[PDB]
Design an enzyme around this catalytic site. Structure first.
Site, PDB file in Angstrom:
ATOM      1  N   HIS A 166       2.211   9.072   0.662  1.00 22.57           N
ATOM      2  CA  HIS A 166       0.860   8.847  -0.416  1.00 22.57           C
ATOM      3  C   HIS A 166       1.287   9.821  -1.291  1.00 22.57           C
ATOM      4  O   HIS A 166       1.779  10.935  -1.375  1.00 22.57           O
ATOM      5  CB  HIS A 166      -0.379   9.341   0.101  1.00 22.57           C
ATOM      6  CG  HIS A 166      -0.875   8.653   1.377  1.00 22.57           C
ATOM      7  ND1 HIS A 166      -1.326   7.373   1.576  1.00 22.57           N
ATOM      8  CD2 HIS A 166      -0.504   8.834   2.979  1.00 22.57           C
ATOM      9  CE1 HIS A 166      -1.690   6.974   2.731  1.00 22.57           C
ATOM     10  NE2 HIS A 166      -0.938   7.874   3.347  1.00 22.57           N
ATOM     11  N   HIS A 206       5.495   7.114   6.409  1.00 17.22           N
ATOM     12  CA  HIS A 206       5.204   6.561   4.938  1.00 17.22           C
ATOM     13  C   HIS A 206       4.837   8.077   4.221  1.00 17.22           C
ATOM     14  O   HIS A 206       4.440   9.015   4.459  1.00 17.22           O
ATOM     15  CB  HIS A 206       4.340   5.302   4.916  1.00 17.22           C
ATOM     16  CG  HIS A 206       2.778   6.019   5.557  1.00 17.22           C
ATOM     17  ND1 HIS A 206       2.432   5.943   6.869  1.00 17.22           N
ATOM     18  CD2 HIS A 206       1.667   6.576   5.144  1.00 17.22           C
ATOM     19  CE1 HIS A 206       1.375   6.570   6.885  1.00 17.22           C
ATOM     20  NE2 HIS A 206       0.974   6.806   6.019  1.00 17.22           N
ATOM     21  N   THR A 226      -6.036   7.070   7.716  1.00 15.67           N
ATOM     22  CA  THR A 226      -6.361   7.050   6.167  1.00 15.67           C
ATOM     23  C   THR A 226      -6.389   5.956   5.327  1.00 15.67           C
ATOM     24  O   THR A 226      -6.868   5.821   4.486  1.00 15.67           O
ATOM     25  CB  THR A 226      -5.807   8.207   5.382  1.00 15.67           C
ATOM     26  OG1 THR A 226      -4.388   7.706   5.176  1.00 15.67           O
ATOM     27  CG2 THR A 226      -5.981   9.410   6.298  1.00 15.67           C
ATOM     28  N   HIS A 230       3.455  11.236   6.157  1.00 18.81           N
ATOM     29  CA  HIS A 230       2.969  10.751   7.252  1.00 18.81           C
ATOM     30  C   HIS A 230       3.743  10.527   8.358  1.00 18.81           C
ATOM     31  O   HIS A 230       4.105   9.376   8.250  1.00 18.81           O
ATOM     32  CB  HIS A 230       1.603  10.094   7.274  1.00 18.81           C
ATOM     33  CG  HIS A 230       0.471  10.863   6.411  1.00 18.81           C
ATOM     34  ND1 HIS A 230      -0.651   9.882   5.828  1.00 18.81           N
ATOM     35  CD2 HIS A 230       0.103  12.001   6.209  1.00 18.81           C
ATOM     36  CE1 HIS A 230      -1.285  10.725   5.543  1.00 18.81           C
ATOM     37  NE2 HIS A 230      -0.775  11.926   5.440  1.00 18.81           N
ATOM     38  N   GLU A 238      -3.393  13.455   0.167  1.00 15.93           N
ATOM     39  CA  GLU A 238      -4.689  13.221   1.005  1.00 15.93           C
ATOM     40  C   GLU A 238      -5.390  14.275   1.552  1.00 15.93           C
ATOM     41  O   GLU A 238      -6.660  14.555   1.073  1.00 15.93           O
ATOM     42  CB  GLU A 238      -4.388  12.192   2.260  1.00 15.93           C
ATOM     43  CG  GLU A 238      -3.875  11.034   1.641  1.00 15.93           C
ATOM     44  CD  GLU A 238      -4.178   9.613   2.404  1.00 15.93           C
ATOM     45  OE1 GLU A 238      -3.822   9.792   3.709  1.00 15.93           O
ATOM     46  OE2 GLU A 238      -4.534   8.569   2.041  1.00 15.93           O
ATOM     47  N   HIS A 251       0.919  -1.425   0.020  1.00 15.57           N
ATOM     48  CA  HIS A 251       0.155   0.011  -0.057  1.00 15.57           C
ATOM     49  C   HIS A 251       0.823   1.201  -0.103  1.00 15.57           C
ATOM     50  O   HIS A 251       0.285   2.331  -0.280  1.00 15.57           O
ATOM     51  CB  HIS A 251      -0.851   0.149   1.470  1.00 15.57           C
ATOM     52  CG  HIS A 251      -1.737  -1.210   1.411  1.00 15.57           C
ATOM     53  ND1 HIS A 251      -1.603  -2.062   2.563  1.00 15.57           N
ATOM     54  CD2 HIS A 251      -2.745  -1.715   0.592  1.00 15.57           C
ATOM     55  CE1 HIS A 251      -2.786  -2.873   2.376  1.00 15.57           C
ATOM     56  NE2 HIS A 251      -3.232  -2.755   1.318  1.00 15.57           N
TER      57      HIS A 251
END
Ligand SMILES: O=C(O)Cc1cccc([N+](=O)[O-])c1
Ligand SMILES: [Zn+2]
EC number: 4.2.1.1
Length: 257
Positions: free
Chosen positions: A93, A91, A195, A116, A103, A61
Protein backbone atom coordinates in the site's frame (compact mmCIF):
# COMPACT_ATOMS: atom_id res chain seq x y z
CA UNK A 1 -17.55 -1.63 -6.43
CA UNK A 2 -15.24 -0.64 -3.65
CA UNK A 3 -12.01 1.28 -4.17
CA UNK A 4 -10.11 4.22 -2.76
CA UNK A 5 -12.03 7.28 -4.04
CA UNK A 6 -14.37 9.85 -2.74
CA UNK A 7 -17.29 7.84 -3.73
CA UNK A 8 -16.14 4.34 -3.06
CA UNK A 9 -13.30 4.53 -0.59
CA UNK A 10 -12.82 3.30 2.95
CA UNK A 11 -15.43 5.48 4.43
CA UNK A 12 -18.07 3.69 2.24
CA UNK A 13 -16.96 0.08 2.67
CA UNK A 14 -19.25 -0.63 5.61
CA UNK A 15 -22.35 -0.51 3.35
CA UNK A 16 -21.32 -3.61 1.44
CA UNK A 17 -19.15 -5.07 4.24
CA UNK A 18 -20.69 -4.22 7.61
CA UNK A 19 -17.80 -5.97 9.39
CA UNK A 20 -15.92 -2.73 8.55
CA UNK A 21 -17.30 -1.42 11.85
CA UNK A 22 -16.40 -4.61 13.73
CA UNK A 23 -14.44 -5.23 16.90
CA UNK A 24 -11.16 -6.34 15.38
CA UNK A 25 -10.55 -4.19 12.28
CA UNK A 26 -7.20 -3.29 10.79
CA UNK A 27 -5.04 -1.32 10.43
CA UNK A 28 -4.54 0.44 13.77
CA UNK A 29 -2.28 3.06 15.22
CA UNK A 30 0.49 1.43 17.28
CA UNK A 31 0.99 3.49 20.39
CA UNK A 32 4.49 2.56 21.31
CA UNK A 33 4.18 3.68 24.85
CA UNK A 34 1.27 1.49 25.58
CA UNK A 35 2.24 -1.64 23.70
CA UNK A 36 3.54 -3.90 26.41
CA UNK A 37 6.62 -6.04 26.07
CA UNK A 38 5.57 -9.64 26.31
CA UNK A 39 8.47 -11.93 27.32
CA UNK A 40 6.35 -14.92 26.41
CA UNK A 41 6.47 -13.97 22.67
CA UNK A 42 8.92 -15.89 20.57
CA UNK A 43 11.27 -14.88 17.89
CA UNK A 44 9.62 -14.92 14.61
CA UNK A 45 10.68 -17.66 12.21
CA UNK A 46 10.58 -16.56 8.61
CA UNK A 47 11.62 -19.41 6.35
CA UNK A 48 11.63 -18.26 2.78
CA UNK A 49 14.63 -20.15 1.33
CA UNK A 50 12.33 -22.29 -0.88
CA UNK A 51 9.77 -19.69 -1.80
CA UNK A 52 8.58 -20.03 -5.36
CA UNK A 53 7.17 -16.95 -6.83
CA UNK A 54 5.18 -17.41 -9.95
CA UNK A 55 3.48 -14.30 -11.17
CA UNK A 56 2.69 -10.60 -10.53
CA UNK A 57 -0.79 -9.34 -10.85
CA UNK A 58 -2.49 -5.78 -11.06
CA UNK A 59 -5.76 -6.50 -9.41
CA UNK A 60 -7.04 -3.02 -9.70
CA UNK A 61 -6.26 -2.19 -5.96
CA UNK A 62 -2.61 -3.03 -5.76
CA UNK A 63 -0.27 -5.50 -7.32
CA UNK A 64 0.16 -8.99 -5.92
CA UNK A 65 3.50 -11.06 -6.09
CA UNK A 66 2.09 -14.64 -6.01
CA UNK A 67 3.63 -17.78 -4.73
CA UNK A 68 3.14 -21.47 -5.24
CA UNK A 69 1.53 -22.40 -1.93
CA UNK A 70 0.87 -26.06 -2.91
CA UNK A 71 3.64 -27.25 -0.57
CA UNK A 72 5.35 -25.96 2.74
CA UNK A 73 7.90 -23.98 0.95
CA UNK A 74 7.83 -20.47 2.44
CA UNK A 75 6.45 -20.51 5.96
CA UNK A 76 6.02 -18.23 8.90
CA UNK A 77 5.99 -19.73 12.39
CA UNK A 78 6.86 -18.74 15.93
CA UNK A 79 6.41 -15.26 17.10
CA UNK A 80 2.85 -15.07 18.49
CA UNK A 81 1.71 -17.94 16.26
CA UNK A 82 0.74 -21.58 16.98
CA UNK A 83 1.41 -23.72 14.00
CA UNK A 84 2.56 -23.07 10.45
CA UNK A 85 1.47 -20.42 8.01
CA UNK A 86 2.26 -20.66 4.28
CA UNK A 87 3.10 -17.67 2.13
CA UNK A 88 0.53 -17.04 -0.66
CA UNK A 89 1.23 -13.46 -1.82
CA UNK A 90 2.66 -10.12 -0.99
CA UNK A 91 1.53 -6.67 -1.93
CA UNK A 92 1.97 -3.08 -0.92
CA UNK A 93 0.00 0.00 0.00
CA UNK A 94 1.41 3.45 -0.83
CA UNK A 95 0.72 7.11 -1.06
CA UNK A 96 0.55 9.91 -3.56
CA UNK A 97 3.42 11.56 -1.60
CA UNK A 98 6.05 10.22 0.75
CA UNK A 99 4.16 11.55 3.82
CA UNK A 100 1.42 8.95 3.64
CA UNK A 101 0.86 5.45 2.35
CA UNK A 102 1.14 3.08 5.25
CA UNK A 103 -1.89 1.44 6.81
CA UNK A 104 -0.53 0.93 10.26
CA UNK A 105 0.87 4.00 11.91
CA UNK A 106 3.40 4.27 14.76
CA UNK A 107 2.54 6.98 17.28
CA UNK A 108 0.42 8.50 14.40
CA UNK A 109 3.45 8.49 12.03
CA UNK A 110 2.60 7.42 8.53
CA UNK A 111 5.25 5.75 6.39
CA UNK A 112 5.52 6.10 2.63
CA UNK A 113 4.35 2.56 2.08
CA UNK A 114 3.64 -0.78 3.75
CA UNK A 115 4.41 -4.26 2.53
CA UNK A 116 2.10 -7.12 3.49
CA UNK A 117 3.26 -10.70 3.26
CA UNK A 118 0.20 -12.85 3.56
CA UNK A 119 0.24 -16.35 4.97
CA UNK A 120 -2.50 -18.89 5.71
CA UNK A 121 -2.67 -21.42 8.50
CA UNK A 122 -2.01 -24.83 7.09
CA UNK A 123 -4.40 -26.42 9.60
CA UNK A 124 -7.33 -25.12 7.46
CA UNK A 125 -6.04 -26.62 4.23
CA UNK A 126 -6.59 -23.66 1.81
CA UNK A 127 -6.73 -19.90 1.89
CA UNK A 128 -10.47 -19.69 1.36
CA UNK A 129 -11.16 -21.86 4.41
CA UNK A 130 -8.53 -20.06 6.47
CA UNK A 131 -10.10 -16.65 6.03
CA UNK A 132 -13.20 -17.99 7.76
CA UNK A 133 -11.26 -18.59 10.99
CA UNK A 134 -10.04 -16.14 13.63
CA UNK A 135 -6.55 -17.59 13.45
CA UNK A 136 -6.62 -18.25 9.74
CA UNK A 137 -4.01 -15.76 8.46
CA UNK A 138 -0.77 -14.23 9.60
CA UNK A 139 0.21 -11.04 7.86
CA UNK A 140 3.71 -9.71 8.20
CA UNK A 141 3.71 -5.95 7.77
CA UNK A 142 6.84 -4.03 6.93
CA UNK A 143 7.04 -0.24 6.65
CA UNK A 144 8.82 1.50 3.80
CA UNK A 145 10.58 4.81 4.11
CA UNK A 146 12.18 6.77 1.24
CA UNK A 147 15.96 6.98 1.24
CA UNK A 148 18.41 4.43 -0.11
CA UNK A 149 17.25 2.07 -2.74
CA UNK A 150 16.32 -1.50 -1.79
CA UNK A 151 18.25 -3.62 -4.26
CA UNK A 152 15.95 -6.54 -3.60
CA UNK A 153 12.87 -4.60 -4.67
CA UNK A 154 14.22 -3.57 -8.08
CA UNK A 155 13.02 -6.78 -9.87
CA UNK A 156 9.50 -5.92 -8.79
CA UNK A 157 9.73 -2.27 -9.86
CA UNK A 158 11.05 -3.10 -13.26
CA UNK A 159 8.09 -5.49 -14.09
CA UNK A 160 5.45 -2.88 -13.23
CA UNK A 161 5.42 -1.30 -16.71
CA UNK A 162 4.05 -4.61 -17.98
CA UNK A 163 1.10 -4.59 -15.56
CA UNK A 164 0.09 -1.01 -15.74
CA UNK A 165 -3.59 -1.55 -15.71
CA UNK A 166 -6.18 -3.62 -13.84
CA UNK A 167 -6.24 -7.27 -14.83
CA UNK A 168 -2.81 -7.41 -16.31
CA UNK A 169 -0.44 -10.17 -15.09
CA UNK A 170 3.06 -11.26 -15.94
CA UNK A 171 5.31 -14.22 -15.22
CA UNK A 172 7.38 -13.52 -12.15
CA UNK A 173 9.37 -16.42 -11.21
CA UNK A 174 12.38 -16.81 -8.95
CA UNK A 175 11.84 -13.71 -6.93
CA UNK A 176 13.24 -14.00 -3.42
CA UNK A 177 11.20 -12.14 -0.78
CA UNK A 178 14.10 -12.31 1.67
CA UNK A 179 15.34 -9.28 -0.17
CA UNK A 180 12.48 -7.23 1.25
CA UNK A 181 13.12 -7.89 4.92
CA UNK A 182 14.82 -5.52 7.40
CA UNK A 183 17.71 -6.60 9.59
CA UNK A 184 15.64 -6.91 12.79
CA UNK A 185 12.60 -9.10 13.28
CA UNK A 186 11.43 -7.12 16.33
CA UNK A 187 7.67 -6.77 16.06
CA UNK A 188 4.35 -5.70 17.43
CA UNK A 189 1.41 -8.07 17.24
CA UNK A 190 -2.31 -7.82 17.64
CA UNK A 191 -5.50 -9.56 16.37
CA UNK A 192 -7.16 -7.90 13.41
CA UNK A 193 -8.53 -8.13 9.93
CA UNK A 194 -7.91 -8.00 6.25
CA UNK A 195 -7.51 -4.33 5.27
CA UNK A 196 -9.44 -4.67 2.02
CA UNK A 197 -12.93 -6.05 1.52
CA UNK A 198 -14.18 -8.47 2.65
CA UNK A 199 -12.39 -7.18 5.80
CA UNK A 200 -12.60 -10.56 7.49
CA UNK A 201 -11.45 -10.71 11.09
CA UNK A 202 -9.03 -13.60 10.48
CA UNK A 203 -5.57 -12.11 10.87
CA UNK A 204 -2.82 -12.25 13.46
CA UNK A 205 -0.88 -9.11 12.55
CA UNK A 206 2.88 -9.05 12.98
CA UNK A 207 4.23 -5.56 12.24
CA UNK A 208 7.97 -5.19 12.13
CA UNK A 209 9.46 -2.20 13.98
CA UNK A 210 12.33 -1.60 11.59
CA UNK A 211 11.33 -0.10 8.20
CA UNK A 212 13.04 -0.86 4.98
CA UNK A 213 14.41 1.94 2.86
CA UNK A 214 13.46 2.29 -0.80
CA UNK A 215 14.43 5.00 -3.14
CA UNK A 216 12.24 7.84 -4.38
CA UNK A 217 12.66 6.40 -7.87
CA UNK A 218 11.34 3.04 -6.73
CA UNK A 219 8.22 4.44 -5.11
CA UNK A 220 7.65 6.74 -8.02
CA UNK A 221 7.29 3.66 -10.21
CA UNK A 222 4.59 2.28 -7.90
CA UNK A 223 2.72 5.57 -8.44
CA UNK A 224 2.72 5.14 -12.21
CA UNK A 225 0.41 2.10 -11.94
CA UNK A 226 -3.25 2.55 -12.74
CA UNK A 227 -6.40 1.58 -10.91
CA UNK A 228 -8.29 1.56 -14.21
CA UNK A 229 -8.29 -1.08 -16.90
CA UNK A 230 -6.57 -0.81 -20.36
CA UNK A 231 -7.81 2.00 -22.28
CA UNK A 232 -10.07 3.52 -19.68
CA UNK A 233 -9.62 7.12 -18.18
CA UNK A 234 -6.36 7.15 -16.35
CA UNK A 235 -6.51 7.30 -12.58
CA UNK A 236 -3.13 6.73 -10.97
CA UNK A 237 -2.83 3.88 -8.39
CA UNK A 238 -1.97 5.98 -5.34
CA UNK A 239 -3.33 6.26 -1.81
CA UNK A 240 -4.51 2.66 -1.77
CA UNK A 241 -4.40 2.50 2.04
CA UNK A 242 -7.14 2.11 4.65
CA UNK A 243 -6.71 4.50 7.57
CA UNK A 244 -6.30 3.38 11.19
CA UNK A 245 -9.40 1.90 12.78
CA UNK A 246 -10.51 1.87 16.41
CA UNK A 247 -8.46 -0.43 18.62
CA UNK A 248 -11.50 -1.34 20.79
CA UNK A 249 -10.86 -4.13 23.13
CA UNK A 250 -7.33 -5.04 21.92
CA UNK A 251 -3.89 -5.14 23.25
CA UNK A 252 -0.86 -4.61 21.07
CA UNK A 253 2.12 -6.64 22.31
CA UNK A 254 5.78 -5.98 21.66
CA UNK A 255 8.37 -8.69 21.14
CA UNK A 256 11.14 -6.38 22.34
CA UNK A 257 12.14 -4.29 25.33
O1 LIG B 1 -8.32 -9.67 -2.47
C1 LIG B 1 -8.54 -8.99 -1.40
O2 LIG B 1 -8.42 -7.76 -1.36
C2 LIG B 1 -8.92 -9.61 -0.08
C3 LIG B 1 -7.61 -10.00 0.54
C4 LIG B 1 -6.82 -11.15 0.19
C5 LIG B 1 -5.66 -11.51 0.73
C6 LIG B 1 -5.08 -10.66 1.66
C7 LIG B 1 -5.72 -9.52 2.11
N1 LIG B 1 -5.21 -8.69 3.16
O3 LIG B 1 -5.84 -7.78 3.72
O4 LIG B 1 -3.96 -8.82 3.52
C8 LIG B 1 -6.98 -9.22 1.52
ZN1 LIG C 1 -2.41 -5.12 2.48
Amino acid sequence: HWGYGKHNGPEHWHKDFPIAKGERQSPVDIDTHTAKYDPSLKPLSVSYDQATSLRILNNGHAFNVEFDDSQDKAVLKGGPLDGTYRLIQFHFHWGSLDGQGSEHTVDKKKYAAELHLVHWNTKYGDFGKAVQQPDGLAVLGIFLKVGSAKPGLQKVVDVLDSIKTKGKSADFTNFDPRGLLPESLDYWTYPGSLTTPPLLECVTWIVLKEPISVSSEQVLKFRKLNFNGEGEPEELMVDNWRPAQPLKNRQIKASFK
